[PDB]
Amino acid sequence: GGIQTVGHVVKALALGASTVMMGSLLAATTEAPGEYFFSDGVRLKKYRGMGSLKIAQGVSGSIQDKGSIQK
Amino acid sequence: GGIQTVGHVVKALALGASTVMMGSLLAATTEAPGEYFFSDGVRLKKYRGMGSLKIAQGVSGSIQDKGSIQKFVPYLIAGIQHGCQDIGARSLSVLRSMMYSGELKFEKRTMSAQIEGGVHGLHSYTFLPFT
Amino acid sequence: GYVPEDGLTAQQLFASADGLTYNDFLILPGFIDFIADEVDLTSALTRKITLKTPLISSPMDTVTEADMAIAMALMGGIGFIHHNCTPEFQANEVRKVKKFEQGFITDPVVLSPSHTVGDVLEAKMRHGFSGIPITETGTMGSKLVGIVTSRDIDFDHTTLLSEVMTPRIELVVAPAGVTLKEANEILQRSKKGKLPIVNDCDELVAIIARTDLKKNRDYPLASKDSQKQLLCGAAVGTREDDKYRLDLLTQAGVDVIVLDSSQGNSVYQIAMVHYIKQKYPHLQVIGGNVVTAAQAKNLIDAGVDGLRVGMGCGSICITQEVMACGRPQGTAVYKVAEYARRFGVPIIADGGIQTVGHVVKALALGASTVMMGSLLAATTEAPGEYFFSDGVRLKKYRGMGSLKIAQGVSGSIQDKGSIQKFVPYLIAGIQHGCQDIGARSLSVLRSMMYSGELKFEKRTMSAQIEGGVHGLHSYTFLPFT
Amino acid sequence: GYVPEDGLTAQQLFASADGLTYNDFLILPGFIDFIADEVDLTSALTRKITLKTPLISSPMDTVTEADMAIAMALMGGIGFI
Amino acid sequence: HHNCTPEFQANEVRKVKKFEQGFITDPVVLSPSHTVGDVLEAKMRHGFSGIPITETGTMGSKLVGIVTSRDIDFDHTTLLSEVMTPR
Numbered sequence: 072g073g074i075q076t077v078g079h080v081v082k083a084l085a086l087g088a089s090t091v092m093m094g095s096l097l098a099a100t101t102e103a104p105g106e107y108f109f110s111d112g113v114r115l116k117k118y119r120g121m122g123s124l125k126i127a128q129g130v131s132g133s134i135q136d137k138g139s140i141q142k
Numbered sequence: 143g144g145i146q147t148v149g150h151v152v153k154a155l156a157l158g159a160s161t162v163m164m165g166s167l168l169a170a171t172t173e174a175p176g177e178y179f180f181s182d183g184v185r186l187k188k189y190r191g192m193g194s195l196k197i198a199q200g201v202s203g204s205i206q207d208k209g210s211i212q213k214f215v216p217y218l219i220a221g222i223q224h225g226c227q228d229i230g231a232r233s234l235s236v237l238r239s240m241m242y243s244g245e246l247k248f249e250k251r252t253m254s255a256q257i258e259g260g261v262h263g264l265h266s267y268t269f270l271p272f273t
Numbered sequence: 274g275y276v277p278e279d280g281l282t283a284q285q286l287f288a289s290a291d292g293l294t295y296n297d298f299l300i301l302p303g304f305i306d307f308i309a310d311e312v313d314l315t316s317a318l319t320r321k322i323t324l325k326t327p328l329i330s331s332p333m334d335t336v337t338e339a340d341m342a343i344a345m346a347l348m349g350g351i352g353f354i355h356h357n358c359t360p361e362f363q364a365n366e367v368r369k370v371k372k373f374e375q376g377f378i379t380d381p382v383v384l385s386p387s388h389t390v391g392d393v394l395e396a397k398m399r400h401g402f403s404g405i406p407i408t409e410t411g412t413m414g415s416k417l418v419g420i421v422t423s424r425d426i427d428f429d430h431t432t433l434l435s436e437v438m439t440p441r442i443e444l445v446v447a448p449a450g451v452t453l454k455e456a457n458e459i460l461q462r463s464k465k466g467k468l469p470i471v472n473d474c475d476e477l478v479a480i481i482a483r484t485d486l487k488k489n490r491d492y493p494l495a496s497k498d499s500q501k502q503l504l505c506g507a508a509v510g511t512r513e514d515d516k517y518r519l520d521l522l523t524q525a526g527v528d529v530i531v532l533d534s535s536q537g538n539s540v541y542q543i544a545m546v547h548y549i550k551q552k553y554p555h556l557q558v559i560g561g562n563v564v565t566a567a568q569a570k571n572l573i574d575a576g577v578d579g580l581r582v583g584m585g586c587g588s589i590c591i592t593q594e595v596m597a598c599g600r601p602q603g604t605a606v607y608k609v610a611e612y613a614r615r616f617g618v619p620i621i622a623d624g625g626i627q628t629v630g631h632v633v634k635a636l637a638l639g640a641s642t643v644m645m646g647s648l649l650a651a652t653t654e655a656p657g658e659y660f661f662s663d664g665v666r667l668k669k670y671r672g673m674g675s676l677k678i679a680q681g682v683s684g685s686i687q688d689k690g691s692i693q694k695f696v697p698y699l700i701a702g703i704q705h706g707c708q709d710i711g712a713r714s715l716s717v718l719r720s721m722m723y724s725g726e727l728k729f730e731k732r733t734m735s736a737q738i739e740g741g742v743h744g745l746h747s748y749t750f751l752p753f754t
Numbered sequence: 755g756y757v758p759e760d761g762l763t764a765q766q767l768f769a770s771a772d773g774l775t776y777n778d779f780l781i782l783p784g785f786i787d788f789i790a791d792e793v794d795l796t797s798a799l800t801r802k803i804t805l806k807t808p809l810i811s812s813p814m815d816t817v818t819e820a821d822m823a824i825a826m827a828l829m830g831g832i833g834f835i
Numbered sequence: 836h837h838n839c840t841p842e843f844q845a846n847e848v849r850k851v852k853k854f855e856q857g858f859i860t861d862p863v864v865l866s867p868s869h870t871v872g873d874v875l876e877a878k879m880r881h882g883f884s885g886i887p888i889t890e891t892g893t894m895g896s897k898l899v900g901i902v903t904s905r906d907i908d909f910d911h912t913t914l915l916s917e918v919m920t921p922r
């Protein structure tokens with residue numbers, strides 16, 4: 072987590088991490104589950120946090136379409 | 143052209159058009175040509191008017207992604223025929239017969255009544271057309 | 274001694290076909306010779322059912338779980354239960370809306386004196402009801418043994434229930450066949466309230482509770498049927514399997530149903546009105562959304578007991594822009610209420626109502642009641658949850674056509690607090706504007722409508738930009754609510 | 755047994771020259787006695803050519819390279835290059 | 836908060852102390868000669884409603900009975916001894 076660009080992936084590999092685990096950067100790719108909805112002229116797809124429904128330790132949000140994970 | 147929702151297609155057909163013709167509503171489908179650019183956080187694809195580069199008589203702009211035309215056209219079909227049902231017509235030929243026979247009846251929607259559906263009466267919203 | 278008549282009469286507006294809505298017109302003021310809160314509001318819902326107030330909650334899933342039905346029926350109105358859920362759930366909802374206050378309770382939870390007291394705590398958690406009579410076989414077909422009370426469970430559990438209940442020798446009781454005005458007095462004068470009813474054989478037949486006398490004192494305007502319990506409504510769809518849903522709702526004791534549709538005129542709907550009114554002769558039925566008199570004729574011929582009117586006009590809606598088919602709400606409500614009035618059926622004005630002025634307009638145009646969506650969303654008893662977003666305590670507002678095609682949006686509304694304080698503000702805003710109009714009751718108001726005494730004027734767009742205008746830097750409202 | 759006719763007919767709208775567009779009017783609802791997907795859509799494009807659906811893609815450079823012509827002709831419509 | 840007259844702030848802290856109690860040591864009490872409309876007045880003025888009755892209407896007197904909200908479901912006018920529960 073906290074990875075949001077390719078540069079952050081290279082930084083995380085050149086620091087000891089053997090692999091990097093992606094959340095937001097793969098949300099709203101085509102095969103991430105669910106549905107796309109126009110909010111304000113944007114084809115965004117949901118991005119729920121597991122701690123976002125005892126207390127809530129995540130938010131729930133949405134991300135713009137990124138197309139197929141194959142590309 | 144000038145058609146920007148499925149309701150405008152049913153209106154154009156119930157007025158004597160044999161077909162509609164689409165521009166912006168098919169731009170930014172997957173098989174519309176060219177490339178996508180993320181801009182201010184939106185996966186939009188270019189939309190150029192032919193008169194937009196002696197004088198310029200169109201603009202050059204952009205449209206948000208609508209996915210494959212292979213799913214979009216069945217949504218237009220299933221929205222036309224589902225509104226042709228409410229009109230009461232069993233085919234588009236019957237619909238234009240109703241047009242020219244006086245059986246269809248219209249009313250003028252004064253400006254104040256154009257501010258209806260998806261109105262100035264929500265904080266914020268998301269549509270989700272089946273698309 | 275002569276003063277010129279000013280302003281268009283009722284009929285002169287809707288002759289020129291400009292398709293007016295509630296924003297496009299005003300109602301000219303009259304003469305005032307009564308106090309603002311004097312005026313009556315009694316209004317028919319359907320031919321046989323009448324409400325002490327003209328407000329109804331819309332049957333959307335985002336508005337009417339049972340808690341709103343209760344809190345709105347308790348203040349004159351009526352509540353319709355949303356239909357987009359399994360029939361068993363909707364039957365439970367309408368059942369626990371009926372059971373919030375009672376006359377002769379005729380099917381109480383009852384226990385055998387052999388139970389463990391931890392089973393009283395189980396029953397109290399499972400039903401909320403907590404002052405339970407005891408009978409030998411733990412059913413209505415048995416002799417009265419005693420009563421157990423929340424006042425008996427301040428004490429681990431384990432005890433047999435005969436040790437802690439109060440026995441039949443010591444409690445007060447009344448003989449069966451008593452009417453619900455003598456039994457009420459006998460409970461009042463035997464000032465310890467849970468009075469059971471037993472026949473001459475001393476076996477349990479019914480009970481009464483003081484809490485419902487307390488509710489009668491507290492909510493004088495509530496709409497209760499003959500058995501002295503709240504009136505309840507269900508939406509149902511027109512589909513072949515909603516024919517099963519109907520039986521569960523009727524066994525749960527629903528009083529009214531609305532045949533929920535985007536377009537009321539269908540051969541499927543007209544066939545279902547016949548099925549309802551042939552199988553269940555008691556039920557009142559309300560017809561699906563109509564906008565023109567040419568389609569009200571089919572519903573009234575079918576046998577419907579009222580109509581709801583308007584389509585595509587609404588906050589959450591997008592049906593005009595997907596179907597191309599609709600009608601501006603102000604024209605529709607008058608042009609169908611004038612026709613439907615000839616047959617004596619009520620009309621209810623369905624949605625597109627977003628301030629108290631739109632309610633006074635809808636009633637002074639022939640609607641027997643209004644029906645509310647967005648104006649009751651984000652009240653406390655509208656179902657679900659609140660989320661802070663961009664610093665606002667907003668609660669969801671889903672259109673049913675919003676997830677084959679989608680004909681509503683899904684959105685959210687800022688908090689409005691408890692419906693218990695909001696409905697009296699609508700009532701005190703309606704009746705206070707009915708004073709300025711000059712009408713002593715809503716029946717008089719529609720008589721003025723149809724007699725030409727009321728006079729309107731068209732408010733051109735440049736005059737809609739009035740009140741709260743482009744003439745303040747920034748501002749705050751405060752409806753006292 | 756009589757129900758008043760409500761609403762302007764087709765010709766009565768465009769007699770008063772206010773230059774209406776698709777936003778300015780509605781179509782009043784009728785009677786329904788068929789399923790929503792029963793309705794036929796066959797429509798002429800020109801005197802000799804007919805299409806199973808009334809949709810056409812506009813001949814703009816930003817809309818109709820061959821891949822849209824294919825994907826639209828495959829679903830009733832037609833595509834102009 | 837302190838930006839208000841001392842009398843108001845003393846009332847505030849007093850009705851914060853009196854929301855739950857052990858031995859209530861200074862209850863509202865009445866003489867049996869009162870009119871029942873004075874019980875409704877006291878209930879509206881204090882919120883408290885289950886009131887004991889004593890011969891001189893003060894703590895320095897013999898008990899006579901109690902009156903409760905369960906005794907006021909009935910215009911007013913009656914002498915309070917008719918409607919109490921007795922000692």
Ligand SMILES: NC(=O)c1ccc[n+]([C@@H]2O[C@H](COP(=O)([O-])OP(=O)(O)OC[C@H]3O[C@@H](n4cnc5c(N)ncnc54)[C@H](O)[C@@H]3O)[C@@H](O)[C@H]2O)c1
Pocket residue numbers: 224227510511512513533534535536541562583584585592673674680789790
């Ligand atoms: N004014 C509005 O648009 C409005 C208001 C409230 C709710 N809704 C909701 O939107 C939906 C709109 O569709 P609907 O109103 O036609 O009801 P519906 O959802 O039951 O009908 C869905 C489709 O099936 C058809 N249909 C309905 N009953 C049928 C039957 N018995 N046999 C065969 N086909 C049948 C209809 O023509 C429609 O095309 C409804 O589910 C309703 O709950 C709409």
Ligand SMILES: Nc1nc2c(ncn2[C@@H]2O[C@H](COP(=O)(O)OP(=O)(O)OP(=O)(O)O)[C@@H](O)[C@H]2O)c(=O)[nH]1
Pocket residue numbers: 374375376377453454457481482485486489493501
């Ligand atoms: N046990 C019980 N008694 C009630 C209830 N509601 C009303 N009663 C009383 O039982 C009687 C009902 O008979 P009615 O004469 O038809 O009712 P009412 O006089 O119009 O009184 P309201 O309906 O409350 O305005 C009244 O005295 C009511 O005050 C209730 O919910 N439970």
Ligand SMILES: Nc1nc2c(ncn2[C@@H]2O[C@H](COP(=O)(O)OP(=O)(O)OP(=O)(O)O)[C@@H](O)[C@H]2O)c(=O)[nH]1
Pocket residue numbers: 372373374375378380381382402403404423480481482483484485
């Ligand atoms: N008697 C009885 N009342 C029921 C039942 N189901 C719902 N109720 C309603 O629940 C109401 C309140 O229940 P009570 O038992 O009076 O509540 P309570 O335990 O005295 O305690 P409070 O809620 O504090 O008054 C009753 O007056 C009825 O309207 C049932 O099975 N039996």
Ligand SMILES: Nc1nc2c(ncn2[C@@H]2O[C@H](COP(=O)(O)OP(=O)(O)OP(=O)(O)O)[C@@H](O)[C@H]2O)c(=O)[nH]1
Pocket residue numbers: 855856857858
């Ligand atoms: N009449 C009355 N009795 C109380 C009240 N609070 C506690 N009691 C009971 O009186 C007793 C108080 O004496 P303590 O032994 O010092 O209190 P405790 O055992 O610590 O109980 P808590 O303080 O409630 O946790 C307890 O049994 C309490 O349960 C009260 O507010 N009013």
Ligand SMILES: Nc1nc2c(ncn2[C@@H]2O[C@H](COP(=O)(O)OP(=O)(O)OP(=O)(O)O)[C@@H](O)[C@H]2O)c(=O)[nH]1
Pocket residue numbers: 853854855856859861862863883884885904
């Ligand atoms: N006894 C008494 N209690 C007081 C007084 N002032 C405040 N109270 C508090 O108010 C609480 C509740 O009053 P109750 O008389 O028990 O309330 P109630 O009238 O019986 O009716 P409910 O509130 O429904 O139980 C008491 O337990 C005290 O904590 C007072 O002068 N006398």
Ligand SMILES: Nc1ncnc2c1ncn2[C@@H]1O[C@H](COP(=O)(O)OP(=O)(O)OP(=O)(O)O)[C@@H](O)[C@H]1O
Pocket residue numbers: 404420421422423424425439443444445446465466467468469
């Ligand atoms: N019919 C009756 N006649 C006399 N006493 C009764 C009767 N029914 C119940 N009681 C008893 O009188 C006492 C008060 O009962 P009541 O129903 O008023 O308590 P409650 O309303 O449940 O109390 P609470 O409001 O504190 O929870 C209890 O001991 C109860 O068992």
Ligand SMILES: O=c1[nH]cnc2c1ncn2[C@@H]1O[C@H](COP(=O)(O)O)[C@@H](O)[C@H]1O
Pocket residue numbers: 072073074075092093094095096119120121122123128129130
């Ligand atoms: O709800 C949540 N609360 C807290 N951490 C979460 C939650 N859901 C996921 N995570 C973590 O947050 C990371 C998000 O990845 P990111 O979106 O790429 O930054 C995940 O890989 C998890 O480690």
Ligand SMILES: O=c1[nH]cnc2c1ncn2[C@@H]1O[C@H](COP(=O)(O)O)[C@@H](O)[C@H]1O
Pocket residue numbers: 143144145146163164165166167190191192193194199200201812813814
């Ligand atoms: O540059 C231009 N100037 C003017 N009209 C244009 C131009 N390019 C395309 N059009 C029109 O725009 C239509 C596309 O539909 P539209 O997206 O609704 O506007 C086309 O079919 C043409 O009629």
Ligand SMILES: O=c1[nH]cnc2c1ncn2[C@@H]1O[C@H](COP(=O)(O)O)[C@@H](O)[C@H]1O
Pocket residue numbers: 331332333585586587588589590591592623624625626627644645646647648671672673674675680681682
């Ligand atoms: O999804 C939908 N599509 C169409 N109409 C709807 C939908 N959901 C609710 N409605 C209408 O919206 C009304 C709610 O009142 P409103 O908030 O003023 O719009 C309801 O009573 C219905 O008439």
